[PDB]
Design a protein around this ligand. Structure first.
Ligand SMILES: [Zn+2]
Length: 257
Protein backbone atom coordinates (compact mmCIF):
# COMPACT_ATOMS: atom_id res chain seq x y z
CA UNK A 1 0.00 0.00 0.00
CA UNK A 2 1.10 3.61 -0.41
CA UNK A 3 3.30 5.35 2.12
CA UNK A 4 6.53 7.36 2.37
CA UNK A 5 9.27 4.72 2.12
CA UNK A 6 11.63 3.91 -0.73
CA UNK A 7 9.36 1.32 -2.32
CA UNK A 8 5.92 2.91 -1.80
CA UNK A 9 6.68 6.64 -1.54
CA UNK A 10 5.31 9.63 -3.46
CA UNK A 11 7.24 8.82 -6.69
CA UNK A 12 5.23 5.56 -6.84
CA UNK A 13 1.74 6.90 -6.13
CA UNK A 14 0.81 7.48 -9.78
CA UNK A 15 0.62 3.72 -10.44
CA UNK A 16 -2.40 3.36 -8.12
CA UNK A 17 -3.66 6.98 -8.37
CA UNK A 18 -2.99 8.34 -11.86
CA UNK A 19 -4.36 11.78 -10.89
CA UNK A 20 -0.96 12.11 -9.15
CA UNK A 21 0.22 13.49 -12.50
CA UNK A 22 -2.85 15.73 -12.90
CA UNK A 23 -3.17 19.43 -13.63
CA UNK A 24 -3.87 20.83 -10.14
CA UNK A 25 -1.76 18.77 -7.72
CA UNK A 26 -0.44 19.93 -4.34
CA UNK A 27 1.82 20.95 -2.66
CA UNK A 28 3.65 23.61 -4.71
CA UNK A 29 6.53 26.01 -4.23
CA UNK A 30 5.23 29.52 -3.52
CA UNK A 31 7.40 31.94 -5.51
CA UNK A 32 6.74 35.16 -3.56
CA UNK A 33 7.86 37.34 -6.46
CA UNK A 34 5.41 35.91 -9.01
CA UNK A 35 2.40 35.61 -6.70
CA UNK A 36 -0.23 38.19 -7.66
CA UNK A 37 -1.55 40.56 -5.04
CA UNK A 38 -5.33 40.52 -5.54
CA UNK A 39 -7.10 43.39 -3.72
CA UNK A 40 -10.46 41.71 -4.36
CA UNK A 41 -9.61 38.98 -1.83
CA UNK A 42 -11.46 39.32 1.48
CA UNK A 43 -10.06 38.76 4.97
CA UNK A 44 -10.36 35.23 6.28
CA UNK A 45 -13.11 34.64 8.82
CA UNK A 46 -12.14 31.91 11.30
CA UNK A 47 -14.91 31.08 13.79
CA UNK A 48 -13.57 28.36 16.08
CA UNK A 49 -15.08 29.52 19.38
CA UNK A 50 -17.62 26.66 19.40
CA UNK A 51 -15.25 23.94 18.14
CA UNK A 52 -15.87 20.46 19.58
CA UNK A 53 -12.90 18.14 19.32
CA UNK A 54 -13.64 14.45 19.82
CA UNK A 55 -10.75 12.12 19.18
CA UNK A 56 -7.13 11.80 18.12
CA UNK A 57 -6.13 8.95 15.85
CA UNK A 58 -2.96 7.49 14.32
CA UNK A 59 -4.04 6.42 10.83
CA UNK A 60 -0.68 5.05 9.72
CA UNK A 61 0.55 8.15 7.89
CA UNK A 62 -0.17 10.98 10.35
CA UNK A 63 -2.26 11.66 13.46
CA UNK A 64 -5.61 13.36 13.02
CA UNK A 65 -7.47 15.45 15.63
CA UNK A 66 -11.16 15.00 14.63
CA UNK A 67 -14.00 17.43 15.31
CA UNK A 68 -17.79 17.19 15.46
CA UNK A 69 -18.88 18.44 12.02
CA UNK A 70 -22.62 17.70 12.25
CA UNK A 71 -23.41 21.42 12.71
CA UNK A 72 -21.80 24.77 11.92
CA UNK A 73 -19.65 24.87 15.06
CA UNK A 74 -16.13 25.59 13.75
CA UNK A 75 -16.23 27.21 10.32
CA UNK A 76 -14.06 29.01 7.80
CA UNK A 77 -15.54 31.72 5.58
CA UNK A 78 -14.41 34.72 3.59
CA UNK A 79 -11.03 34.89 1.94
CA UNK A 80 -11.36 33.38 -1.54
CA UNK A 81 -14.25 31.16 -0.44
CA UNK A 82 -17.95 31.24 -1.27
CA UNK A 83 -20.19 29.73 1.35
CA UNK A 84 -19.35 28.04 4.63
CA UNK A 85 -16.74 25.34 5.28
CA UNK A 86 -16.87 23.16 8.43
CA UNK A 87 -13.71 21.97 10.19
CA UNK A 88 -13.51 18.16 10.21
CA UNK A 89 -9.93 17.39 11.25
CA UNK A 90 -6.41 18.70 11.44
CA UNK A 91 -3.06 16.94 11.15
CA UNK A 92 0.61 17.66 10.49
CA UNK A 93 3.43 16.70 8.11
CA UNK A 94 6.94 16.68 9.54
CA UNK A 95 10.53 15.75 8.90
CA UNK A 96 13.26 13.56 10.32
CA UNK A 97 15.33 16.76 10.67
CA UNK A 98 14.47 20.38 11.45
CA UNK A 99 15.46 21.45 7.92
CA UNK A 100 12.63 19.60 6.18
CA UNK A 101 9.07 18.50 6.77
CA UNK A 102 6.71 21.03 5.25
CA UNK A 103 4.84 20.19 2.07
CA UNK A 104 4.55 23.67 0.64
CA UNK A 105 7.73 25.70 0.37
CA UNK A 106 8.29 29.46 0.14
CA UNK A 107 10.94 30.51 -2.37
CA UNK A 108 12.17 26.89 -2.06
CA UNK A 109 12.51 27.23 1.75
CA UNK A 110 11.37 24.15 3.69
CA UNK A 111 9.88 24.42 7.19
CA UNK A 112 10.17 21.85 9.96
CA UNK A 113 6.49 20.89 9.69
CA UNK A 114 3.16 21.96 8.21
CA UNK A 115 -0.25 22.04 9.89
CA UNK A 116 -3.35 21.29 7.79
CA UNK A 117 -6.84 22.27 9.04
CA UNK A 118 -9.28 20.54 6.71
CA UNK A 119 -12.74 22.01 6.06
CA UNK A 120 -15.59 20.89 3.78
CA UNK A 121 -18.26 22.92 1.88
CA UNK A 122 -21.63 22.65 3.65
CA UNK A 123 -23.49 22.88 0.30
CA UNK A 124 -22.40 19.23 -0.40
CA UNK A 125 -23.90 17.79 2.84
CA UNK A 126 -21.03 15.55 3.88
CA UNK A 127 -17.27 15.21 3.50
CA UNK A 128 -17.46 12.26 1.09
CA UNK A 129 -19.58 14.29 -1.37
CA UNK A 130 -17.33 17.40 -0.98
CA UNK A 131 -14.13 15.56 -2.15
CA UNK A 132 -15.85 14.88 -5.51
CA UNK A 133 -16.29 18.63 -6.19
CA UNK A 134 -13.76 21.24 -7.42
CA UNK A 135 -14.74 23.63 -4.60
CA UNK A 136 -15.46 20.91 -2.04
CA UNK A 137 -12.63 21.45 0.45
CA UNK A 138 -10.69 24.33 2.01
CA UNK A 139 -7.42 23.51 3.77
CA UNK A 140 -5.73 26.12 5.96
CA UNK A 141 -1.96 25.52 5.91
CA UNK A 142 0.32 26.83 8.66
CA UNK A 143 4.09 26.45 8.70
CA UNK A 144 6.02 25.49 11.83
CA UNK A 145 9.57 26.62 12.56
CA UNK A 146 11.68 25.49 15.50
CA UNK A 147 12.22 28.14 18.17
CA UNK A 148 10.12 28.92 21.24
CA UNK A 149 7.48 26.46 22.44
CA UNK A 150 3.86 26.79 21.39
CA UNK A 151 1.83 26.44 24.60
CA UNK A 152 -1.43 25.61 22.78
CA UNK A 153 0.25 22.64 21.07
CA UNK A 154 1.39 20.90 24.26
CA UNK A 155 -1.93 19.15 24.91
CA UNK A 156 -1.53 17.41 21.55
CA UNK A 157 2.11 16.51 22.21
CA UNK A 158 1.35 14.99 25.60
CA UNK A 159 -1.24 12.52 24.27
CA UNK A 160 0.94 11.14 21.45
CA UNK A 161 2.28 8.32 23.65
CA UNK A 162 -1.23 6.85 23.81
CA UNK A 163 -1.54 6.63 19.98
CA UNK A 164 2.00 5.51 19.05
CA UNK A 165 0.96 2.83 16.52
CA UNK A 166 -1.38 2.72 13.56
CA UNK A 167 -5.08 2.31 14.38
CA UNK A 168 -4.70 3.59 17.94
CA UNK A 169 -7.25 6.25 19.01
CA UNK A 170 -7.80 8.27 22.19
CA UNK A 171 -10.55 10.54 23.45
CA UNK A 172 -9.51 14.13 22.83
CA UNK A 173 -12.15 16.60 23.99
CA UNK A 174 -12.15 20.33 24.68
CA UNK A 175 -9.11 21.10 22.53
CA UNK A 176 -9.22 24.68 21.24
CA UNK A 177 -7.65 25.03 17.76
CA UNK A 178 -7.42 28.82 18.15
CA UNK A 179 -4.22 28.07 20.09
CA UNK A 180 -2.52 27.01 16.83
CA UNK A 181 -3.04 30.16 14.78
CA UNK A 182 -0.40 32.83 14.08
CA UNK A 183 -0.94 36.50 14.86
CA UNK A 184 -1.57 37.57 11.26
CA UNK A 185 -4.01 35.94 8.83
CA UNK A 186 -2.35 37.18 5.61
CA UNK A 187 -2.31 34.34 3.10
CA UNK A 188 -1.59 33.00 -0.35
CA UNK A 189 -4.28 31.00 -2.14
CA UNK A 190 -4.36 28.66 -5.14
CA UNK A 191 -6.50 25.72 -6.38
CA UNK A 192 -4.98 22.35 -5.57
CA UNK A 193 -5.45 18.79 -4.38
CA UNK A 194 -5.25 16.53 -1.37
CA UNK A 195 -1.59 15.78 -0.76
CA UNK A 196 -2.21 12.12 0.12
CA UNK A 197 -4.09 9.48 -1.88
CA UNK A 198 -6.65 9.70 -3.29
CA UNK A 199 -5.07 13.09 -4.39
CA UNK A 200 -8.44 14.51 -5.52
CA UNK A 201 -8.35 18.02 -7.04
CA UNK A 202 -11.06 19.38 -4.71
CA UNK A 203 -9.06 21.82 -2.55
CA UNK A 204 -8.85 25.58 -2.29
CA UNK A 205 -5.52 25.98 -0.52
CA UNK A 206 -5.12 28.88 1.92
CA UNK A 207 -1.51 29.06 3.12
CA UNK A 208 -0.70 31.56 5.89
CA UNK A 209 2.38 33.75 5.44
CA UNK A 210 3.32 33.86 9.13
CA UNK A 211 4.67 30.60 10.61
CA UNK A 212 4.17 29.57 14.22
CA UNK A 213 7.08 28.61 16.47
CA UNK A 214 7.33 25.24 18.24
CA UNK A 215 10.15 24.04 20.42
CA UNK A 216 12.70 21.41 19.49
CA UNK A 217 11.22 19.19 22.23
CA UNK A 218 7.71 19.47 20.80
CA UNK A 219 8.67 18.39 17.29
CA UNK A 220 10.89 15.62 18.73
CA UNK A 221 7.76 13.97 20.14
CA UNK A 222 6.13 13.93 16.68
CA UNK A 223 9.08 11.82 15.50
CA UNK A 224 8.51 9.09 18.15
CA UNK A 225 5.27 8.01 16.45
CA UNK A 226 5.14 4.85 14.34
CA UNK A 227 3.90 4.14 10.82
CA UNK A 228 3.42 0.47 11.77
CA UNK A 229 0.77 -1.23 13.84
CA UNK A 230 1.42 -2.60 17.29
CA UNK A 231 3.31 -5.88 17.20
CA UNK A 232 4.91 -5.05 13.83
CA UNK A 233 8.53 -3.96 13.28
CA UNK A 234 8.98 -0.33 14.25
CA UNK A 235 9.23 2.23 11.41
CA UNK A 236 9.38 5.80 12.83
CA UNK A 237 6.74 8.19 11.47
CA UNK A 238 8.99 10.87 9.95
CA UNK A 239 9.16 12.63 6.57
CA UNK A 240 5.47 12.07 5.83
CA UNK A 241 5.48 14.94 3.33
CA UNK A 242 4.93 15.01 -0.44
CA UNK A 243 7.43 16.99 -2.57
CA UNK A 244 6.36 20.10 -4.45
CA UNK A 245 4.49 19.46 -7.71
CA UNK A 246 4.51 21.47 -10.96
CA UNK A 247 2.35 24.62 -10.83
CA UNK A 248 1.28 24.14 -14.49
CA UNK A 249 -1.57 26.50 -15.57
CA UNK A 250 -2.14 27.99 -12.13
CA UNK A 251 -1.64 31.36 -10.48
CA UNK A 252 -0.92 31.91 -6.81
CA UNK A 253 -2.69 34.97 -5.41
CA UNK A 254 -1.71 36.88 -2.26
CA UNK A 255 -3.97 38.74 0.17
CA UNK A 256 -1.13 41.18 0.93
CA UNK A 257 1.53 43.32 -0.72
ZN1 LIG B 1 -1.82 17.21 5.11
Amino acid sequence: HWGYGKHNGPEHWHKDFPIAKGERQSPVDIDTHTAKYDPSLKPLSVSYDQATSLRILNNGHAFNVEFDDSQDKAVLKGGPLDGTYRLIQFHFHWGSLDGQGSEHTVDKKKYAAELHLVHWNTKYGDFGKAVQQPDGLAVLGIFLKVGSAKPGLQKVVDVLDSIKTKGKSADFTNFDPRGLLPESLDYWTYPGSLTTPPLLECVTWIVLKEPISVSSEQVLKFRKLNFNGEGEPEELMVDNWRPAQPLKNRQIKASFK
